[PDB]
Symmetry: D2
């Protein structure tokens, strides 16, 4: 029910081998590790979770943008990109979190479908 897609606005390409960490907000308001992986050759990270595990709650998707730019020999602005959202059962069932990266900027959108 959760996919992450990362694109590179400098090169016009998928952002490949980017580390992505997902956290779930715990009852004590700390962030607990939930899922992680590296984006593929297509800039996508599939298979993070299952419908059973992905219960309603607040989630954070952290994208390791700084390492990505450093590997390309570029000095970037941000430490990482964060996307924080609530998963809601009455909304559509599948969430795609997309991020478009530049050295000093990023944009993100959610595509939520059934």
């Amino acid at each position: 029910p959760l996919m992450v897609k990362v694109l590179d606005a400098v090169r016009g390409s998928p952002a490949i081998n980017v580390a992505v960490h997902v956290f779930r907000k715990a009852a004590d308001d700390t962030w607990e590790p939930f899922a992680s992986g590296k984006t593929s050759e297509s800039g996508e990270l599939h298979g993070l979770t299952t419908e059973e595990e992905f219960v309603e709650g607040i989630y954070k998707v952290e994208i390791d943008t700084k390492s990505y730019w450093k590997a390309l020999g570029i000095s970037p602005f941000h430490e990482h990109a964060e996307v924080v959202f609530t998963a809601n059962d009455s909304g559509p069932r599948r969430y795609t979190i997309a991020a478009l990266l530049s050295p000093y900027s990023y944009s993100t959108t959610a595509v939520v479908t059934n």
Copy 2:
């Protein structure tokens, strides 16, 4: 070799049934019709052209954003969104033109791969 993808930043969804027109710049500097279609349920328009037909040149992708917003009962700012670019044979072979739409803003990116 050309795909167009359109997303809605207000609803968090693909932008469905959006008209898209592609033009090729002629030798007299006018824009000639090249390809057109309506985005699908996934917000994508596939099958616009073939490798044989998609020669080097300057192309314009016009997305009929105004009709899209009007159909949702929303008054938008732009008449349409335009994306104008050169197709180059020495670059990668497949072009995805992506647009993210809001009533008073849009963003676009190109993902060019082999």
Copy 3:
């Protein structure tokens, strides 16, 4: 009543010396030249027009992004960024067209105010 602001997402800076051409749709449906200029050291272009001259119409703001990236020695994707809009159709407004540039992507937004 018309201002254009351009930022560079690679440098984290204003996009300076960007050429901007504005056109207005004529009665015969062609694009007539309306005004032009270049962004300053602040990435802003002021003074394109006056409230008298900026009548109702369909306007196109063409931002010459390829010339900007090539002047910097960089090969970008787009030829330019075009913003096309109806202006002043419920009376005079003030328009700021802002653009954020990367080599293979741009974002644009409008801020419309009623003086």
Copy 4:
């Protein structure tokens, strides 16, 4: 040396009365409150800090987008927009953090200048 600017992509207007909280990473790796405020009628928030107080560090600018869209009666996707960056590590700079908001999307950029 720190300014935050927020625009609304639905209205084509400044995003007014948006709460912004800034944090700074402490020695113990926790986020310490640093400053806070609300955007004005222009969508800008000035006066968060001083050049003396804005020392080298890792800073987080949290823009309370959900409170903004809910204050407007709208149900948005994100809880907030977070911008996290190292500041002043090659000496004092001036930072503008700009954000463009939609219910299911946002864009942010930084303009970094050397006074």
